[model samples]
Target: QGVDPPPPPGPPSFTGTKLVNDADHPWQPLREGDIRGPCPGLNTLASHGYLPRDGVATPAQIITATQEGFNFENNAAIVATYLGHLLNGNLVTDLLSIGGATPKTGPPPPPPAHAGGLNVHGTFEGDAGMTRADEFFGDNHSFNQTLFDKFVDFSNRYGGGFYNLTVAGELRYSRIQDSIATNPEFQFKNVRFITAYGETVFPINLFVDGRVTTDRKLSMEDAASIFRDMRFPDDFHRSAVPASNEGADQVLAAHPWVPGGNADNQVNNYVEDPDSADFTHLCRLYEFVVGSVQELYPNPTGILRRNLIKNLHYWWTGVNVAFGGCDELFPYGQL
Candidate 1:
């Protein structure tokens, strides 16, 4: 007699297609729609036979489905397999190196032995006014959060919890880069990539801010392509660089302590919170601090904070598409 939970709310409307741009160049426009709720496209795929009819399919199920649904020896297979490589710890080393440090002191401690799932989040700023692409992608704010939640759920099912998660969020694209160049402390210091490995067990976030040169003018198409291409499995493999093993002390000794600024004056704030006793709590604090800073600054030139959130979400969705482990018998297996 629990009142049947209101019949599950009629499955919601199919907004996925509506939220995206025209089928031809779906990646062009950047939309800022509500990304907090369930994804209609995911549900639609599940409802139909294209994906698994089950609620949420595991990573393995997604991979298998890709193999069986598409030609094994075709570009799809190579693309899919390559994606698996990217997600499976290939980029860790390189990404750490990019930050000007070795992994021993930079990247967080490795996750549990069985950790396989990954959840990546990227946050950026959205354009202020409505544009052709915005119409296609929907509102920037909601879409970003929605995509993150979906990936987190997806990773939980397949990779097991938030551990082994890789997240990236940035502020502003290229067009607005010049406008905010003077404000060195501004969050819009090019695109940022944050990778968290143990959301399920340990609370640690690894981030990389891909330096962008103002001299190089890049089109939106080019930028999106770069982002999409970077997510591929092979791209991640390239991240396996060496670590400095300096730990927190080494990091603190570098930038902030360099004569010019105080320990807290640097843009890339890397302070450990003593209050966080567990990994989950640590992740929550990390996100809160970063998100708050982003919201406060709200990059003026590139994608707004809201849209940046959506882009991050979209990136995660692509990850699922690339490495979801789906097989022949269980096209959509349990998470």
Candidate 2:
């Protein structure tokens, strides 16, 4: 092969939102042409060549949008939670601290309690902006902008459905939460996961802080794909099925994380006393499964990484050992 090769991806970053807002802050009017982000649902209801010309989608439209948002919330509470970009900071601290730290309260403190780094709960996660749900629909404050009023208006309408005290001296309207939001018959919290694993699973009730999680050990397909570039045409990967010995065993046999992860119960012992030989091999086998999904799933939220894991993202460090950097996630060197 002759001279130089192409450059690689720049450093993997924890890219986040603008920490501060603009001094000359301008809130742009939300519009149908605002198709850049959330227009998928917006596109659905519009009529005409443009049923939405300018002053489009009145209060009812806002209610509909809020209702749709509830549907998404249900999915989130179910089998579709993730642990990615939001917790990049998490991986750096807790488990990987340089040395031990004792608990202490700092700054605006009540003189300390625990010594551990910040985390949300059972899993090492964040409070995700921690803004209480109630403050979201607070009084006529600036934060109580037109957006919240829509939610509050919708709430008051449905509960206060239509025909209210038709006058605070009236530009009057009434609200409704609809059949989808009804109580004992139908409510957000009533839905539950129904499955047939072990016992015939029933509607697993969840109230307030209640929860559910689905766990499955890695498959051979899962293990193999993570360590290699599985996107391109290759007989090796193409033939690897989720069934039989060709399944979990073949893949986990080579995994450093489980010297014997391919076999049941063979994993724990291997992890405790992993030898040098295998990890070195997996290190050299690293590759990216890049293919360009943007052409297929163009939405910012739609086009996604090939990795099957819900939220965690793993990338090869651009600087292979030759360039003086290491793969932040995997064992060092060999690669």
Q: How many residue pairs clash in each candidate?
A: 73, 11
lDDT of 2 by residue, 55-86 (tens): 13222222232122211122111111112111
Error of 1 at 183 (Å): 13
TM-score of 2: 0.16
Model 1 stretches astray by more than 4 angstroms: 1-44, 47-49, 53-74, 81-110, 113-118, 121-142, 145-335
Q: What is the lDDT of residue 156 in candidate 2?
A: 48
lDDT of 1: 0.24
lDDT (C-alpha) at residue 20 in model 1: 15
How well does model 2 score by local distance difference test?
Answer: 0.20
Listed in order, each prediction's TM-score against the native is 0.21, 0.16
